[PDB]
């Protein structure tokens, strides 16, 4: 009850689905740049921080 010509339609559907998946999963989160997350890297330096202006 399933002819062979109807298969590429299903293949098109699944290709659309997996492309909608991969266009999202191709994105990834980079390294964090918030200074509040890395202020202790500077707090723990071997010398005190110079606020130079």
């Amino acid at each position: 009850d399933v002819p062979i010509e109807k298969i590429p339609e299903h293949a098109n559907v699944l290709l659309k689905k997996i492309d909608a998946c991969l266009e999202i999963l191709s994105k990834d989160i980079g390294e964090v740049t918030d200074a509040e997350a890395h202020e202790m890297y500077f707090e723990t330096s071997k010398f005190q921080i110079l606020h130079i202006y």
Binding site: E43, T44, K46, Q48
Partner: protein
């Protein structure tokens, strides 16, 4: 010493707490000198010597 105090610089709580046991050292330094020459009653010293041996009230 600079290394140790540079780490004390980076501490947060110990550098504000661990010094509170230091006055107790000077307390001992003062009380010891008070006790080296404290005048005491001879009768009380002969009746109740502190941690002396062969005291039957202690047991030995």
């Amino acid at each position: 010493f600079y290394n140790l105090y540079n780490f004390v610089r980076i501490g947060r709580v110990s550098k504000y707490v661990c010094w509170l046991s230091l006055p107790l050292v000077f307390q001992r330094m003062w009380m010891k000198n008070r006790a080296t020459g404290m005048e005491y009653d001879i009768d009380l010293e002969n009746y109740a010597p502190f941690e002396a041996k062969k005291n039957p009230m202690h047991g030995h």
